Amino acid sequence: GVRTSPTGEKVTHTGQAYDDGDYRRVRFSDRQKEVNENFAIDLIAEQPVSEVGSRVISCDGGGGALGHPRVYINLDKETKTGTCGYCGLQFRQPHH
Amino acid sequence: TQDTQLIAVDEKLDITTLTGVPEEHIKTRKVRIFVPARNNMQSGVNNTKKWKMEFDTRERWENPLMGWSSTADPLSNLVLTFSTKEDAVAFAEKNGWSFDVEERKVPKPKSKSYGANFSWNKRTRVSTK
Amino acid sequence: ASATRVIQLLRNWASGRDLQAKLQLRYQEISKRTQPPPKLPVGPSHKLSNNYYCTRDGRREAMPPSIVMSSQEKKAVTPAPPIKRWELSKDQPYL
Amino acid sequence: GTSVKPIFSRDMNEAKRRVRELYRAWYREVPNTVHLFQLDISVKQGRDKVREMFMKNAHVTDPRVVDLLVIKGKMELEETINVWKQRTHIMRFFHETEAPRPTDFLSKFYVGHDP
Amino acid sequence: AGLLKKTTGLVGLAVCETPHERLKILYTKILDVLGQIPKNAAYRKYTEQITNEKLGMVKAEPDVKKLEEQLQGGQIEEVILQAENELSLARKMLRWKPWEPLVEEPPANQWKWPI
Amino acid sequence: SNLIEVFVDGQSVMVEPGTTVLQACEKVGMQIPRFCYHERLSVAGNCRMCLVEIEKAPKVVAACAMPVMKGWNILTNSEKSKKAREGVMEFLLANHPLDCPICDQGGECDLQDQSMMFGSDRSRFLEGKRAVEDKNIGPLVKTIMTRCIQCTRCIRFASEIAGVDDLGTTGRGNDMQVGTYIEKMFMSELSGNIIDICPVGALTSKPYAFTARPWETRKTESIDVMDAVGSNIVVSTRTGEVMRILPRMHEDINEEWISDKTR
Amino acid sequence: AVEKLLNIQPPPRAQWIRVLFGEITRLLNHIMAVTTHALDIGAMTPFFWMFEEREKMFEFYERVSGARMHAAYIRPGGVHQDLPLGLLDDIYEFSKNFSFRIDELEEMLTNNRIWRNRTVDIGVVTAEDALNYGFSGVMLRGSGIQWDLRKTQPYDVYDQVEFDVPIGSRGDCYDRYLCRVEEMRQSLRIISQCLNKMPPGEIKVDDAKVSPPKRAEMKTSMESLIHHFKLYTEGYQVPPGATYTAIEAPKGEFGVYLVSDGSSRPYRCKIKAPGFAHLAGLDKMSKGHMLADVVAIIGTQDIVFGEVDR
Amino acid sequence: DTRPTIRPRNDVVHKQLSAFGQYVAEILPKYVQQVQVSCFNELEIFIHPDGVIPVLTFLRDHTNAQFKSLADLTAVDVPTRQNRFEIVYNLLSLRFNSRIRVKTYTDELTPIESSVTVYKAANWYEREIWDMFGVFFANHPDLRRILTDYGFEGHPFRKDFPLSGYVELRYDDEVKRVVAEPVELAQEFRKFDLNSPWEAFPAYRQPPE
Amino acid sequence: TYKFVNMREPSMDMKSVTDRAAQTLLWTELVRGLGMTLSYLFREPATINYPFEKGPLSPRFRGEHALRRYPSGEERCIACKLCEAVCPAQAITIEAEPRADGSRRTTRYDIDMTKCIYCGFCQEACPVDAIVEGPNFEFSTETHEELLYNKEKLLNNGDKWEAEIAANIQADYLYR
Ligand code: SF4
Ligand code: SF4
Ligand code: SF4
Ligand code: SF4
Ligand code: FES
Ligand SMILES: [K+]
Ligand SMILES: [Zn+2]
């Protein structure tokens, strides 16, 4: 979620906000600070974890050639989830 | 050797007045003449074959608008390549650049023996393969 | 294409040619702005066997220049055979 | 080879002769430059600038380098005479906008890292 | 000699009304200039060979069109122009003496590529 | 004076006995392809990338491990040598993950570079790839182990140079994995050197992760002051910021290693 | 030039596409040259009529590449991507009507006693003097020199296409204008054969160490991903060597002297532009002419200073 | 041709150009240092700098050469050579439908002869070489800058000249004119080290030192 | 093959000479020019009523840049820096680091749109279709500074134009 700085400046998804003594805040006066309000980390955190029944699962991001390079994810660790290193989708074996 | 009206000239070639380089970037610069080290990330040796001339790195600050890396050094990216050290030092001398040149570091020859991995009485024997 | 018969006749006469058959404004004759998906073919080396890259590597067949003379009865020659004379056109020799 | 071929001058005196001719031409041109370009400087200022430009290269001993310097000076003179240069080009010898850079060790130490 | 052309098609290239005599005198002049060049010169041998071949063609063929076809040098006015160019070249080669050995070898790695 | 005479593409060289094919090619300026071979490590001869044709010999030999014989002619560019390299690269890339955009090795890999220079340009592998689970060996080396090509460089280094026998291989065949079996930290003053010797992005620096690409960094050669050894180092910088520290070879001081404090 | 240095060959379909769009480009350039020449002389009207056709050809450019002018579409190895479906039909629709526009352009200029008074016997250059001044293209064939790179030294599939080379007789501005107009007509003639003889197949060399793989293979195959990565970060290495390759550009002989040191970046790239040599000859061609004739002589040498100055 | 990707080699033109290179070397031994033909059939003549006018005039005027057109005249900077500047003449023969390249060399202080008497096209090419590389051409009818700004110092196409040069231009409101200042970049050019540590082309391998 | 463009000699008989004299004295070809312009006056103009009517484009059109997401809302960019490496104008500036969830994501992604040449090489290099050139071409600004795009600016461009960006990509990806 997009929060606010103690000065009232809006904090971006990279965690950027000028401190209270930074003169560079004058650039936003009589203007606005451009912040994208769709934090991708919080959005990918909302996706469920797929209960696929295999030790190795494949993920290409969905949409075939319109996704990402196809990768194979190991699902042998029973404490962690196997997540795709391209799009963040998570996978796990059924109910351990 | 040819009919060119050979005129006697000193053997200290100095083209600094003709290069158009501002005077600050001749006396105060210090170039490095070296064979670049092998990038330890790879085991390829094809980048350690020629001599390089690089200038001393000056100040880079942060652009107030975008946070970019600014410079006031015209020679920050200037990198010349040479076949031998002698060519590099001649080029640095005729251009009036103070230089320090370091000797090329090549790998020393090494005695590799696969059969040592299974030595009967030496510590070179490996416990795993 | 909306011009009246009389205006078409006037402009055909003024230009001296029937300009209604070669209108410079495009109409329903153009191709649809939505097209079926394509299916592009693959190249000659999309093979599963008999395809080693060493047999189709153009860059690694380049050679350094052939030195035919270095300072370090034969007939005279030309760089190439003299160029043939161009012959006149058959569609329209004189424009 | 052991020796080299000249540009024009086979000796240092010939190079000096051509340098003096070029200096003469520039010295006579300066008043016409001041008038024609409508420069806000004096003729004394312009001729002192010409002299100071000549004095930058006084350390040159190679007759070929002197010859090339004379060639470039004549080129600059012809750009000035034929009004190929603008007023901005003539006024670039005088770095009026650039601030006085420090010269002593202490001020350079104060303002940054450059030697 | 056939019907005289109204034009050679090329701007500035006037029609020659007497191309055979023109070519004969040009080739004889060329052969005269080559006689001064030393016998062992490759230029002398090669240019004599080609010049005498062309001259024999200009002597075995009366008609201009078949002579042009046999010479393989374009139109006969173009052949005449090439003959004048070769005469000028031979006169210059008489002074240049390119049959002499090489003036000077290049430095050790003057032509080595890549460096 | 006991040098023997061998030929590398017909060019004669005089080598000490026991010199391998790879070294004899190295002294004419030809670098044989390799993954598992490191000159400072023991010879493994497992990646098979160094296979080369000996003239008149029907079977290729591992250049890294085979001592030259008198009168041998090494054919480093014959078609048989190229086909051996292409087959080996195909086998190495069969189960390799498609991680180049997300792998820190990209741009200075070795697998990438030798795929470009010695392997084919396309795949005929029509199956599902291997995937192994990651190992945690401390906060310094990120082990994305499904990128591992099993060259055993890390194991050989850990056992010989560092003197700790923690790295190894478990299982056999296609599911043979490099690691510690148990969950154990790879703590050693020299631990970070298995990152550089690793030819692929299997072993990577955790502090350096995702932060820079090899081509954009400026490389300043300097000396380490974290101790009195004076190890020669390269300082990678980008846009006025120090990015990482790499070893710089000096045979007399640090060879191609630095300590973890230096790194 | 880069493909010659790489010792690789573009595919036949890519070559046919390159020839077709080179002739489309020649139409664009000749329209601009003739109409701006006329506009400078004082005939503003033909400029607009033909710039509508220029806009349509801009649409062809954008449909093939996404950019109206700077396509970046023709690349060492072939072309970037294939033609979209229905593009050949639209090119055919445009070309079948374009000669009528050349007719209207000639109905205003070719026989006009004022246009000829401004171009006949203006800027006359001798054929030999054209050769010695480094002239090329129309500036050569205006003086009757029978020389065209597309025929004498063909490139791509130009040897398989039939066309005529218009040849002048007086070496003046009027003859060069007629040559450019007839070159537009012959460009239409070539375009027709390109439309009818476009072959199937790929549009870049099937060698992933020069031309990048298809995005579908890049996202599926290890070798394709590696080669995509390396081609888009380092680039392909070109074997060391130097070449001078020239084409018959619409403005004359356009060439490049490209030096390669063996790396992925050119060591030296000298660009030969016909306009450089042509504008070097302005002083010669303007001798004994009025001030208004120099405007015509500049227009007949059609000069773009992007290539004059580089 | 079962090799649709490799560029086809034409051996007839290679032989023709080889024979003509032998011919040219034999006719002018005084100036020809080396002649070679590329794998893509391009013939180069390496000459002593003294032989520029003789060799060029021979190639223009000889009835077996007839290289009437000067396609291009440029220079190449190679700092590792004592004669760093490589002068390249590209010539075209319409009569024999052939091209030839003539190369020589020079350093910063030795003048090359002007070839404007051989080709009128050389007038602007030699001015451009002088402008961008600093090579003087003796007996040039009008030698001066052609491409660079008036009063520009340096020769930008030299390999040791910085990409953005040394001065910028901007309008200054105090002095009411455009002024020149030392160059400052809000974002400096980012130098990329792209070369692979592995050898690409074994056939071009230089022998070890 | 070649052809002559001006190699016709006029006929020199009574009728032809009189034809040319009448053309000289009665200005007949000038009347033909007047007729051509008069015929063009009665043709429908090719002008379109901008901005109410727009020039036709194609799905390949290269306009304003945008950063895209997966349907999950997760960013596509995994900071490989291929676009920055290939950028002919060096218009792309990238900084990255591990995200708090461990993802490989950018912390800086700038495009100097006044350095950009709009070549589309970045969207070719991108392995995940993260950076694209969108259809927008009407984004002129009153100041130079609004053309130095941020990661937030480019992500907002992606969220703004994704509906038609995705349709264009679906239209053209089979050619890529
Ligand atoms: S290790 Fe090399 S080949 Fe494997 S994913 Fe990383 S960069 Fe690509
Ligand atoms: S982790 Fe790296 S060094 Fe160790 S075996 Fe695998 S690839 Fe080799
Ligand atoms: S369109 Fe081209 S210039 Fe613009 S950011 Fe992308 S790669 Fe760079
Ligand atoms: S936008 Fe695409 S190419 Fe650029 S860094 Fe992100 S993933 Fe890589
Ligand atoms: S290098 Fe010899 S087998 Fe791995
Ligand atoms: K590694
Ligand atoms: Zn995924």
Could you tell me whether strands B69-71 and B60-62 are parallel, antiparallel, or unpaired per DSSP bridges? antiparallel
Distance CA F88, CA F48 (A): 7
Tokens in use for I94?
């990238």
Pocket of ligand 2 (CB under 6 A): F 148-154, 178, 198-200, 202-203
- Six-digit token string for G102: 């050349």
Interface of I with A in 91-150 (CB under 8 A): 99-101, 103-105, 107-108, 127-129, 150
Q: State the distance from the centre of ligand 4 to the C-alpha of G269, rounded, in angstroms.
A: 30
CA dihedral (G44, G48, G50, G51) positive or negative: positive
Q: Which residue has the tokens 């890549």?
A: E114
Binding site members of A for Zn(2+): 59, 68, 84, 87
Query: Of G113, G106, G120, G220, whose CA–CA distance to G168 is shortest?
Result: G120
Q: Report yes or no on chains H and A touching (3+ CB pairs under 8 A).
A: no
User: Considering only CA atoms, which of I66, I121, I123 is closest in space to residue I89?
Assistant: I121
The DSSP bridge partners found for residue I30 are none
Retrieve residue A54's tokens.
């295999």
Residue F25 labeled ligand binder: no
For residue G220, the chain A residues in CB contact (below 8 A) are: 69-70
CA F36 to ligand 2: nearest atom: 8
Q: Which residues pair with I75 in a beta bridge?
A: I69
Q: Chains near I, with 3+ CB pairs < 8 A?
A: A, B, C, F, G, H
CA distances to D34, D93, H124, I4 from D80, in Å: 11, 12, 21, 50
Token pair belonging to G54: 């220029």
The length of chain D in residues reads 115
Tell if the CB–CB gap between G167 and E12 is shorter than 8 Å. Answer: no
User: Computed over its alpha carbons, how large is the radius of gyration of chain B?
Assistant: 24
> What determination technique applies here?
cryo-EM
- The phi-psi region of residue F66 (left if phi > 0; otherwise alpha if psi is between -120 and 50; otherwise beta) is beta
Could you tell me the two tokens for D77? 């003179």
| G238 and chain E in contact, CB less than 8 A | no
Residues of I in contact with A90 (CB under 8 A): none
Q: Which residue has the tokens 């509508």?
A: G52
Whether residue I81 contacts residue I125, with contact meaning beta carbons closer than 8 Å, is answered with no
Cα Rg of chain E (Å, integer): 19
Q: Give the Cα separation of G50 and G136 in Å (integer).
A: 25
Q: Give chain D positions within 8 Å (CB) of H145.
A: 75
**Cβ–Cβ gap G224/F123 under 8 Å:** yes
- Cβ-count burial A11-44 (b if 16+ within 10 Å, e if not): ebbbebbbeeeeeebeeeeeeebbbbeebbbebb
Contact B70 H187 (CB under 8 A): yes
Q: How far is I4 from chain C (nearest CA, A)?
A: 5
Report the length, in residues, of chain F. 263
Q: How far apart are CA G237 and CA F117, in angstroms?
A: 10
Q: In 10 A of CB C57, how many CB atoms?
A: 20
Nearest CA to D29 out of D80, D69, D72, D74 is that of D80
Q: Nearest CA to D87 among D25, D23, D40?
A: D40
Cβ–Cβ < 8 Å for G201, G12: yes
Long-range contacts of G208-215 (CB under 8 A, 24+ apart): G208/F121, G208/F122, G209/C57, G209/C59, G209/F116, G209/F121, G209/G236, G210/C58, G210/C59, G210/G6, G210/G8, G210/G76, G210/G77, G210/G236, G211/G75, G211/G77, G211/G78, G212/I124, G213/F121, G213/F122, G214/I176, G215/A65, G215/I173, G215/I176
- The single-letter DSSP state of residue I75 is B
Cα(G54)–Cα(G64) distance, integer angstroms: 15
Q: Do chains I and D touch (3 or more CB pairs under 8 A)?
A: no
The candidate with the shortest Cα–Cα distance to B57, out of B32, B34, B82, B87, is B32
Residues of D within 8 A of B8 (CB-CB) are 3
Which positions in chain G touch E13 (Cβ < 8 Å)? 127-128
Instruction: Classify the phi-psi angles of A61: left when phi > 0, otherwise alpha if psi is within -120 to 50, otherwise beta.
Output: left
Q: Quote the ligand 1 centre to F20 CA distance (angstroms).
A: 29
The identity of residue B38, as a single letter, is R
CB contact under 8 A, F105 and B41: yes
Dihedral angle over CA of H74, H79, H80, H86, nearest 10: 10
**Which pair of tokens denotes residue G152?**
């004498």
Asked if F110 contacts B44 with a C-beta cutoff of 8 angstroms, the reply is yes
Q: Are F154 and F225 in contact (CB under 8 A)?
A: no
- Nearest ligand for residue F145 CA: 2
Closest CA to F104 of F21, F220, F195, F189: F195
Helix E76-96 and helix H52-61, axial crossing angle in degrees, nearest 10: 160
For residues B11 and H82, give the distance between their C-alpha atoms in angstroms, rounded to a whole number. Answer: 13
Name the residue range of residue D64's domain: 1-115
Residue G20: closest CA among G90, G105, G99: G90
The 10 Å Cβ neighbour count of residue G192 is 17
Amino acid at G19: V
Q: For residue E49, report the phi and psi dihedrals to the nearest 5 degrees.
A: -60, -50
- List the structure tokens of G144: 């009757």
G240's tokens:
């060391």
Contact I5 G167 (CB under 8 A): yes
Contact with chain A for residue F209, Cβ under 8 A: no
**Beta bridge partners of residue E11, listed in sequence order:** none
Total residue count of chain E as it appears in this document: 115
CB atoms within 10 A of CB G194: 23
Whole-angstrom Cα distance, residue A85 to residue I78? 9
Scan residues 52-111 of B and list those with Cβ closer than 8 Å to E. 81-83
Asked if residue B35 lies in contact with residue B105, where contact means CB atoms within 8 angstroms, the answer is yes
Total residues belonging to chain I: 176
Interface test with C, best of F120, F123, F125, F126 (most C CBs within 10 A): F120
Among residues F145, F125, F149, the alpha carbon closest in space to that of F135 is found at: F145
Q: How many residues does chain G have?
A: 310
How far, in Å, are F19, F26, F62 from residue F70 at the CA level? 11, 17, 17
Q: What is the resolution of this structure in A?
A: 2.1
**Interface contact H196-F31, CB threshold 8 A:** no
Burial (CB < 10 A; 0-12, 13-18, 19+), residue F201, is buried
Residue showing tokens 């589309």:
I120
The number of the ligand nearest the C-alpha atom of F210 reads 4
Instruction: Say whether F179 sits in a helix, a strand or coil.
Output: strand
- Under a CB-based contact definition with an 8 Å cutoff, are residues H146 and H171 in contact? no
Other CB atoms within 10 A of residue H19 CB = 18
Hey, how many other C-beta atoms are within 10 angstroms of the C-beta on B57?
Answer: 14
Single-letter residue type at F130: R
Which residues, listed in sequence order, are joined to residue F245 by a DSSP beta bridge? Answer: F235
Q: Is the CB of I165 under 6 A from ligand 4?
A: no
Atom in ligand 4 nearest the alpha carbon of residue I79 = 5
Do the Cβ atoms of G222 and F93 come within 8 Å? yes
Chain I contact for H190, CB < 8 A?
yes
Residues ≥6 apart with Cβ < 8 Å to E30: E47, E51, E83, E86, E87, E90
F221 CB near a chain B CB, below 8 Å? yes
Task: Render chain B in DSSP notation, one character per residue.
Answer: --SS--B---S----HHHH---THHHHS-EEEEEPPPPPTTS---TTSSSEEEEEPP--EEE-TTT--EEE--TTSS-EEEESSHHHHHHHHHHTT-EEEE-----PPP----GGGGG-SSSTT--S--
Of D7, D68, D89, the CB nearest to H151: D89
Q: DSSP string covering H10-59, please? A: -HHHHHHHHHHHHHHHHH-TTTEEEEEE-TTS-EEEEE-GGGHHHHHHHH
**Which residues of I are less than 8 Å from H190 in CB distance?**
90
* Mutate-to-test residue for ligand 2 from F111, F152, F170, highest number of ligand atoms within 8 A of CB: F152
- The answer to whether the beta carbons of residues E10 and E76 sit under 8 Å apart is no
Please answer yes or no on whether E102 and C71 come within 8 Å at the CB atom: yes
What number of residues does chain H have?
209
Among D56, B78, F217, I85, smallest CA distance to H183 is for: B78
**Of all protein residues, whose CA lies closest to atom 1 belonging to ligand 4?**
I131
Contact G271, G307 (CB under 8 A): yes
Query: Which residue is it, tokens 């150009």?
Result: H17
Tokens of H51: 């032989």
Rounded Cα distance, F239 and F153, in Å:
33
Cβ count near C73 (within 10 Å): 4
H-state helical runs in G110-196: 113-119, 127-132, 138-141, 149-152, 173-196
At G243, which amino acid appears?
T
CA pair distance I35, C29, nearest whole angstrom: 29
Q: Which of G108, G162, G167 sits opposite I4 (nearest CB)?
A: G167
Q: Is the C-beta atom of I94 inside 6 A of ligand 4?
A: yes
Of A95, F113, C95, C9, give the one whose Cα is nearest residue G227: F113
**Token pair listed for G168:** 């002048």
* Strand partners of residue F222: F233
Please work out whether the CB of residue F156 comes within 6 Å of at least one atom of ligand 1.
Answer: no
| Residue that the structure tokens 């050790």 belong to | E108
Q: Determine whether D110 is exposed, middle or buried from the number of CB atoms within 10 Å of its CB (0-12, 13-18, 19+).
A: exposed
- What is the C-alpha separation between H38 and G243, in angstroms, rounded? 9
Provide the token pair at G118: 């401004």
Do chains A and D touch, with touching meaning 3 or more CB–CB pairs less than 8 Å apart? Answer: no
Look up residue E101 and give its two tokens.
């050995």
DSSP code string of C18-78: -TTTT-SS--TTSPPSS-PPP-PPP-TT--SSS--GGGS-SGGG----EEEEE---PPP--
- Whether the link from the prior residue into E114 is cis, omega within 30° of 0, is yes
Tell me if F18 sits within 8 A of H199, measured CB to CB: no
The pair of three-digit structure tokens given for residue D31, joined into one six-digit string: 């008043």
**3-class DSSP state of A41:** helix
For B2, other C-beta atoms within 10 Å of its C-beta total: 12
How far is the C-alpha of H63 from the C-alpha of H56, rounded, in Å? 13
Provide CB contacts within 8 A for G7, sequence distance 6+.
C58, C59, C61, C62, G239, H6, H7, H39, H40
| Cα H66-H99-E112 angle, rounded to 5 deg | 120
Element spanning I149, H or E: strand I148-149
First to last CA, chain B: 67
Structure-token match 């003549």, residue found: H45
Beta strand segments in F20-115, E: 51-54, 61-62, 73-75
Domains held by chain D: number? 1
Token pair, residue E105, equals 């070898």
Other beta carbons within 10 angstroms of residue D83's beta carbon come to 12
Vertex F214 angle, CA F211 and F216, to 5°: 85
Q: Give me the residue from I85, I90, I112 closest to H189, CB to CB.
A: I90
The CA distance from B20 to H166, in Å, is 9
Show the tokens assigned to D8.
Answer: 């024009």
State the CB neighbour count (10 A cutoff) for residue F252: 8
Q: Closest by alpha carbon to I91, among F218, F82, H190, D70?
A: H190
I131 lines ligand 3 (CB under 6 A): no
- Report CB contact under 8 Å: E115, H80: yes
Cβ separation of C80 and H96 shorter than 8 Å?
yes
Q: Is the dihedral of CA F77, F81, F87, F88 positive or negative?
A: negative
Helix (H, G, I), strand (E, B) or coil at F244: strand
> What is the Cα–Cα distance from B99 to B56, expressed in whole angstroms?
10
Tell me the binding residues of I for [4Fe-4S] cluster: 65, 77, 80, 83, 87, 109, 116, 119, 121-122, 126, 133
| Of G250, G247, G189, residue with least CA distance to G30 | G250
**Eight-state DSSP code of residue I109:** E
* Token pair in block for residue C5: 């018969």
Q: Kindly tell me the sign of the dihedral angle through the C-alpha atoms of G28, G34, G37, G38.
A: negative
Token pair of E62 as six digits: 């009366």
How many A from CA of A88 to the centre of ligand 7?
Answer: 6
Helices (H) and strands (E) in chain E, counts: 4, 0
Q: After which residues is chain C broken (C to N over 2.5 A)?
A: 72
Q: Which two tokens stand for residue A73?
A: 């994810």
- Tell me the backbone φ, ψ of residue H73, rounded to 5 degrees: -135, 115
Tell which residue, G87, G92, G44, G38, has the closest CA to residue G62. Answer: G87
Q: Please tell me the distance between residue I117's alpha carbon and the centre of ligand 3 in angstroms.
A: 6
List, as ranges, residues 194-233 from G with C-beta within 8 Å of I. 212, 214-215, 218-219, 225, 228-229, 232-233
Q: Which two tokens stand for residue G194?
A: 């390109």
On the 0-12 / 13-18 / 19+ scale of CB atoms within 10 A, B123 is exposed
Which is nearest to G17 in space by CA: G187, G204, G151? G204
DSSP H84-124: -EEEEEEEEETTTTEEEEEEEEE-TTSPEEP-TTT-TTHHH
Spacing, Cα H198 to ligand 2 middle (Å):
20
Rounded Cα distance between C86 and G241, Å, is 34
What is the pairing mode between strands B98-101 and C66-70? unpaired
E14 touches chain C (CB under 8 A): no
